[PDB]
UniProtKB/Swiss-Prot annotation:
It comes from Severe acute respiratory syndrome coronavirus 2 (2019-nCoV). It is found in: Host endoplasmic reticulum membrane. This is Non-structural protein 4. Signal peptide: none annotated. Residues 2-94 form the Nsp4C domain. Interacts with PL-PRO and nsp6. Plays a role in the formation and maintenance of double membrane vesicles (DMVs) replication organelles. DMVs are formed by nsp3 and nsp4, while nsp6 zippers ER membranes and connects to lipid droplets.
Length: 94
């Protein structure tokens, strides 16, 4: 599997396993300071949901992915990653 950018990965559904963990937690994909900022912000964005085409949704997605990567770093357990909750109705009303 592959992901052109960290932010793209955060917007997609995918199986987070060891291969994808090591690709996504790379400093050339996303520097450590920015990864840690997303991780620190997870609680603020934990239950955010809405249309996908907003700045806050993209930020929330990055925080969700950072948290999922942190979970994998501790557990080593494969998990299905999904981006923040959205809906077709959210998209049409945006």
């Amino acid at each position: 599997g592959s992901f052109s950018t960290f932010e793209e990965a955060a917007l997609c559904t995918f199986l987070l396993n060891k291969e994808m963990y090591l690709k996504l937690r790379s400093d050339v994909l996303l520097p450590l300071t920015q990864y840690n900022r997303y991780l620190a912000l997870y609680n603020k964005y934990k239950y955010f949901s809405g249309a996908m085409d907003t700045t806050s949704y993209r930020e929330a997605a990055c925080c969700h992915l950072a948290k999922a990567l942190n979970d994998f770093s501790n557990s080593g357990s494969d998990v299905l990653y999904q981006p923040p909750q959205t809906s077709i109705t959210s998209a049409v009303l945006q």
